Design a protein around this motif. Structure first.
Motif, mmCIF file in Angstrom:
data_model
loop_
_atom_site.group_PDB
_atom_site.id
_atom_site.type_symbol
_atom_site.label_atom_id
_atom_site.label_comp_id
_atom_site.label_asym_id
_atom_site.label_seq_id
_atom_site.Cartn_x
_atom_site.Cartn_y
_atom_site.Cartn_z
ATOM 1 N N UNK A 174 37.771 45.998 41.093
ATOM 2 C CA UNK A 174 38.868 45.895 42.054
ATOM 3 C C UNK A 174 39.576 44.550 41.951
ATOM 4 N N UNK A 175 38.814 43.461 41.849
ATOM 5 C CA UNK A 175 39.428 42.142 41.746
ATOM 6 C C UNK A 175 40.231 42.023 40.457
ATOM 7 N N UNK A 176 39.641 42.447 39.337
ATOM 8 C CA UNK A 176 40.352 42.419 38.063
ATOM 9 C C UNK A 176 41.653 43.205 38.147
ATOM 10 N N UNK A 177 41.612 44.392 38.757
ATOM 11 C CA UNK A 177 42.795 45.232 38.885
ATOM 12 C C UNK A 177 43.733 44.782 39.997
ATOM 13 N N UNK A 178 43.323 43.830 40.832
ATOM 14 C CA UNK A 178 44.171 43.356 41.905
ATOM 15 C C UNK A 178 44.165 44.211 43.150
ATOM 16 N N UNK A 179 43.262 45.185 43.244
ATOM 17 C CA UNK A 179 43.113 45.984 44.454
ATOM 18 C C UNK A 179 42.233 45.301 45.491
ATOM 19 N N UNK A 180 41.649 44.157 45.144
ATOM 20 C CA UNK A 180 40.929 43.306 46.077
ATOM 21 C C UNK A 180 41.130 41.870 45.620
ATOM 22 N N UNK A 181 41.006 40.933 46.559
ATOM 23 C CA UNK A 181 41.169 39.518 46.259
ATOM 24 C C UNK A 181 40.022 38.715 46.855
ATOM 25 N N UNK A 182 39.633 37.666 46.133
ATOM 26 C CA UNK A 182 38.689 36.668 46.613
ATOM 27 C C UNK A 182 39.117 35.316 46.060
ATOM 28 N N UNK B 10 37.255 35.193 33.922
ATOM 29 C CA UNK B 10 38.698 35.407 33.912
ATOM 30 C C UNK B 10 39.263 35.392 35.326
ATOM 31 N N UNK B 11 38.519 35.947 36.285
ATOM 32 C CA UNK B 11 38.988 35.966 37.666
ATOM 33 C C UNK B 11 38.958 34.570 38.276
ATOM 34 N N UNK B 12 37.919 33.789 37.972
ATOM 35 C CA UNK B 12 37.866 32.410 38.445
ATOM 36 C C UNK B 12 39.076 31.622 37.961
ATOM 37 N N UNK B 13 39.440 31.785 36.688
ATOM 38 C CA UNK B 13 40.629 31.120 36.157
ATOM 39 C C UNK B 13 41.858 31.521 36.962
ATOM 40 N N UNK B 14 42.016 32.824 37.207
ATOM 41 C CA UNK B 14 43.166 33.310 37.965
ATOM 42 C C UNK B 14 43.224 32.673 39.346
ATOM 43 N N UNK B 15 42.082 32.597 40.032
ATOM 44 C CA UNK B 15 42.060 32.031 41.377
ATOM 45 C C UNK B 15 42.262 30.520 41.347
ATOM 46 N N UNK B 16 41.642 29.831 40.385
ATOM 47 C CA UNK B 16 41.820 28.385 40.282
ATOM 48 C C UNK B 16 43.291 28.022 40.117
ATOM 49 N N UNK B 17 44.015 28.759 39.271
ATOM 50 C CA UNK B 17 45.446 28.515 39.110
ATOM 51 C C UNK B 17 46.164 28.706 40.440
ATOM 52 N N UNK B 18 45.896 29.827 41.113
ATOM 53 C CA UNK B 18 46.561 30.110 42.381
ATOM 54 C C UNK B 18 46.284 29.029 43.415
ATOM 55 N N UNK C 6 37.017 41.627 24.493
ATOM 56 C CA UNK C 6 37.563 42.949 24.229
ATOM 57 C C UNK C 6 39.067 42.945 24.498
ATOM 58 N N UNK C 7 39.731 44.042 24.126
ATOM 59 C CA UNK C 7 41.190 44.067 24.188
ATOM 60 C C UNK C 7 41.687 43.840 25.609
ATOM 61 N N UNK C 8 41.030 44.453 26.594
ATOM 62 C CA UNK C 8 41.441 44.266 27.980
ATOM 63 C C UNK C 8 41.269 42.815 28.411
ATOM 64 N N UNK C 9 40.161 42.186 28.012
ATOM 65 C CA UNK C 9 39.926 40.794 28.381
ATOM 66 C C UNK C 9 40.891 39.854 27.670
ATOM 67 N N UNK C 10 41.287 40.180 26.437
ATOM 68 C CA UNK C 10 42.212 39.313 25.716
ATOM 69 C C UNK C 10 43.615 39.397 26.300
ATOM 70 N N UNK C 11 44.046 40.595 26.705
ATOM 71 C CA UNK C 11 45.351 40.726 27.341
ATOM 72 C C UNK C 11 45.413 39.913 28.629
ATOM 73 N N UNK C 12 44.339 39.940 29.422
ATOM 74 C CA UNK C 12 44.292 39.108 30.618
ATOM 75 C C UNK C 12 44.325 37.627 30.256
ATOM 76 N N UNK C 13 43.662 37.246 29.162
ATOM 77 C CA UNK C 13 43.673 35.847 28.745
ATOM 78 C C UNK C 13 45.091 35.382 28.441
ATOM 79 N N UNK C 14 45.856 36.192 27.705
ATOM 80 C CA UNK C 14 47.216 35.800 27.357
ATOM 81 C C UNK C 14 48.066 35.612 28.607
ATOM 82 N N UNK C 15 47.846 36.443 29.627
ATOM 83 C CA UNK C 15 48.606 36.303 30.864
ATOM 84 C C UNK C 15 48.196 35.043 31.617
ATOM 85 N N UNK C 16 46.894 34.746 31.658
ATOM 86 C CA UNK C 16 46.440 33.503 32.270
ATOM 87 C C UNK C 16 47.010 32.290 31.549
#
Length: 223
Positions: free
Chosen positions: A8-16, A38-46, A65-75
């Motif tokens: 849920x957090x990865x997909x953005x349907x929940x936040x912490x 990856x989620x910690x990075x996202x929250x640290x930036x925010x 994996x491909x899903x994790x790499x796509x998230x990395x490029x966005x971060x």
């Protein structure tokens, strides 16, 4: 797919916050740990913790994996924007195909484009706000709608006359029509309200028709 600890957090349907993600990261291993990381990075930036976001980004494993790499490029884009490296952010954004991202990621992709403009009203910013609005929840739409209106009302009649839109941009066309309603009636509050009501019936699908810009609802004027 089968849900894991952080779906849920990865997909953005929940936040912490980052503290939560970092705590979970320390209780996991392998891909589960990467996802929390990856989620910690996202929250640290925010949260404005750019240094720790960068460092934790630099500690990401090479085997993603491909899903994790796509998230990395966005971060990577969000980090460069946090570092005020707008030129580097634009360069990375240009290499991303929005279609290949999930909704939450697309919403963040367009937010990165919005942030890259720095509130500078242009056709590019309007398109980014318009592309993002369908991806946002009801409580996050008004903020987007109000930013769209500020960009429109910050232009002059001449500047807006030079805008060239495509035939399939009916939402942008509707926004530019309301802009003209504003140019033409801003000196008569009563006619402004009626012009807005008629516009709502002209472009009933426009997000601003269902959810008027706050700036146009909360207005003063004299008896």
């Amino acid at each position: 797919s089968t849900p894991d600890q952080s779906t849920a957090y990865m997909q953005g349907t929940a936040q912490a916050d980052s503290a939560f993600y970092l705590q979970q990261m320390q209780q996991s291993s392998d891909d589960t740990r990467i996802n929390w990381q990856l989620l910690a990075i996202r929250a640290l930036v925010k949260e404005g913790k750019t240094g720790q976001a960068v460092e934790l980004f630099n500690q990401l494993p090479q085997e993603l994996n491909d899903a994790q790499r796509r998230e990395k490029t966005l971060l990577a884009v969000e980090i460069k924007l946090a570092q005020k490296d707008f030129a580097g952010a634009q360069n990375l954004l240009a290499k991303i195909t929005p279609a290949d991202l999930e909704q939450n990621q697309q919403a963040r992709y367009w937010q990165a484009k919005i942030d890259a403009s720095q509130g500078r009203p242009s056709i590019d910013l309007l398109r980014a706000l318009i592309a993002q609005e369908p991806l946002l929840g009801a409580k996050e739409k008004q903020q987007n709608i109000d930013a769209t209106w500020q960009a429109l009302s910050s232009m002059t009649q001449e500047q807006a006359n030079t805008l060239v839109i495509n035939a399939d941009e009916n939402i942008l066309q509707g926004w530019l029509d309301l802009q003209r309603v504003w140019f033409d009636n801003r000196n008569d509050p009563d006619m402004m309200k009626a012009g807005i009501a008629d516009w709502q019936k002209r472009y009933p699908n426009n997000p601003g028709a269902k959810m008027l810009p706050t700036q146009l609802v909360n207005v003063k004027a004299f008896k």
